[PDB]
Amino acid sequence: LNPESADLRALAKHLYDSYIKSFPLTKAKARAILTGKTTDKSPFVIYDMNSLMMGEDKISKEVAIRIFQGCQFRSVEAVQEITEYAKSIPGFVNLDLNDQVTLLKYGVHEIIYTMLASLMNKDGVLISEGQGFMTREFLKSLRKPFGDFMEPKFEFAVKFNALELDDSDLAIFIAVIILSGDRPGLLNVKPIEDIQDNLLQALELQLKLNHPESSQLFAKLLQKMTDLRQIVTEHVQLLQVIKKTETDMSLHPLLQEIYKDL
Ligand SMILES: CC(C)(c1cc(Br)c(O)c(Br)c1)c1cc(Br)c(OS(=O)(=O)O)c(Br)c1
């Protein structure tokens, strides 16, 4: 209702727009699939080995390793999407190239897991663009090293999902994440911090208007960044372990570039 906020709202609408355009599977779609809505169709459920083998009919000499390779390839694609989304954050392409690379390097994983929560409930996670649903227990039942990779994400998702954020909230939130001045090796932090200040102002107003009855959701939302960091650290530690165990296992280069010095 005033010039300043009017501009923030425009920023919010801009980001939501690019968000829809960049990410095929939104939380709205995911939620309609997971809760039995007639706007979307129900997923084939993978809860053990037979259903796994059956799912390939409906949707590396070891299922645990090919499930892992599946997630890594889906991550590579995710990076591509986030990158596409980042270019649309006003000011981002105008930054030093080196810093754009740096912002993406430390930003993608925190964003992947933020958005992964949209495809999860306490029982499992959507796969193959919402055509599949792989249960938590089946993932946990995977052999030593791989049985542990998905659990920390489920823990995060259940608490994050309690915030009850929709896509328009998330659009701004993942932009705040990308534009973090504290990232290691940033040449010029000042222009980055000015953009973030703007996003944070937009997120704050968005949360007020969207969740008026929700006290300190802004503060609560920002505190989730601690859990995100911890997820990423554990993940790369787990990967360090995999590389010694499976020397025949290959990590995508784009992913390996992102992992080193993390
Ligand atoms: C949710 C899951 C299992 C998934 C989702 C869709 Br959709 C699929 O099509 C498939 Br196959 C698998 C997944 C797991 C991880 Br671990 C991951 O990134 S990672 O954590 O950086 O490796 C990402 Br991205 C996605």
- 14 labeled part of a ligand binding site: no
Which residue among 109, 116, 142, 258 is best mutated to probe the pocket of ligand 1, counting the most ligand atoms within 8 A of its Cβ? 116
Q: CA 244 to CA 246: how far, in whole Å?
A: 6
- 75 labeled part of a ligand binding site: yes
Which atom of ligand 1 sits closest to the CA of residue 134?
3
Count of domains for the chain: 1
Instruction: For residue 40, give Cα distances in angstroms to 28, 29, 34, 161, 168.
Output: 10, 7, 9, 20, 20
How was this model experimentally determined? Answer: X-ray
Nearest residue by C-alpha to atom 2 in ligand 1: 71
Which residue among 74, 108, 151 is best mutated to probe the pocket of ligand 1, counting the most ligand atoms within 8 A of its Cβ? 74
232's tokens: 């990423």
Task: For tokens 């193959």, name the residue.
Answer: 128
Residues whose beta carbon lies within 6 Å of some atom of ligand 1: 70-72, 74-75, 78, 112, 116, 119, 125-129, 149
Q: At what resolution in Å was this solved?
A: 2.3
Q: Are strands 132-135 and 44-46 parallel, antiparallel or unpaired?
A: parallel
CB atoms closer than 10 angstroms to residue 154 = 19
Which atom of ligand 1 sits closest to the CA of residue 255?
21
CATH of residue 43's domain is 1.10.565.10
- 72 labeled part of a ligand binding site: yes
Which atom of ligand 1 sits closest to the CA of residue 25?
7
**By residue range, what is the domain housing residue 250?**
1-262
